[PDB]
Curated annotation (Swiss-Prot), chains A, B:
Tissue expr: Higher expression in adult small intestine and to a much lesser extent in fetal kidney.
Pfam families for the chain: Lipocalin (PF00061)
Superkingdom of this protein's organism: Eukaryota
The protein, known as: Retinol-binding protein 2
Organism: Homo sapiens (Human)
InterPro entries reported for this sequence: Calycin, Fatty_acid-bd, ILBP, Lipocln_cytosolic_FA-bd_dom
Length: 133, 133
C-alpha cells in the first residue's frame, strides 16, 4: 500500500552508525544519536508529504490532583519513592517531594507564554524556561 | 495565571547537571541528558494535571511533492544542500539527494503494520523498521 499516514515508532535500527559516518556527522553527535529511539509522524495527502522525525531519549509522565498527596515512583529517573503534594502558592505551582532526599521538589508558574520551572534537590537548583509551541 | 495547558519547548536550562548530580543520576544518563533539549506537554483541567516531559535532541522535518524536485538543506543533519527528488516505484517511495555525497537518498515503503526505511549514503546503508502506533 502507498498509505504511509500515521505515527510510527522505531523498533530496529541497523547500521545507523555507518550511515552517519558516511554523512560526515561529527563523532560526538554520532554517539548521542546512535542510542535514541525514533518517532515518525507522516502527514500525506495524495502526492504531498509532511514528514516529521523526532528522536527521543526518555519520556517521564506524572499525573496528580492539586491538594492530593500521591506516591511518585521516578522510574527511568533516580527510581525512588517520594510522597509528593502539589499546591497553589498564588499562581505558582509548588510541589514538595517528601522522601529519601532533602529539599526535593519543583515550582511551576506561567507568565505570558513562558513557563518558568525550577527543580530543587538538596542544595542544587535547576532553572528552566519554556516558550510555548 | 493558573493555566499551564499546552505544549512547551525548552528555551534555557541552567544547572541541569547539578540537579541530576544531586539525584545521584547515573553518569551514563547524565552526560546524554544535559546535551538534549526538552519538551513538556501539560494537559490541565482545573486542579487535575497530566504532565509529560521528553528528552529530545534534534528534530528533522521535510516537505515534498512526489515528482517535484526541491531544495533540501539538511539542517540538523550535516547541513549540506542537496536537490532531492521523491518518486514512486510500485509502492516504494524512493528519494535521490543529488549533491556532494554519492548514492545518497532513502527508500520508504509499507508492509502491513510496519514502516520500512532504508537510508543510503555512498558505501553505507542504514535500515530501520517502525510500527504504527
Amino acid at each position: 500500500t502507498r498509505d504511509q499516514n500515521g505515527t510510527w515508532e522505531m523498533e530496529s535500527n541497523e547500521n545507523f552508525e555507518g550511515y552517519m559516518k558516511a554523512l560526515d556527522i561529527d563523532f560526538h553527535t554520532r554517539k548521542i544519536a546512535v542510542r535514541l529511539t525514533q518517532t515518525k509522524v507522516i502527514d500525506q495527502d495524495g502526492d504531498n508529504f509532511k514528514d516529521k522525525t523526532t528522536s527521543t531519549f526518555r519520556n517521564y509522565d506524572v499525573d496528580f490532583t492539586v491538594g492530593v498527596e500521591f506516591d511518585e515512583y521516578t522510574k527511568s529517573l533516580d527510581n525512588r519513592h517520594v510522597k509528593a503534594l502539589v499546591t497553589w502558592e498564588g499562581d505558582v505551582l509548588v510541589c514538595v517531594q517528601k522522601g529519601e532526599k532533602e529539599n526535593r521538589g519543583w515550582k511551576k508558574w506561567i507568565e505570558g507564554d513562558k513557563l518558568y520551572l525550577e527543580l530543587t534537590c538538596g542544595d542544587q537548583v535547576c532553572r528552566q524556561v519554556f516558550k510555548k509551541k
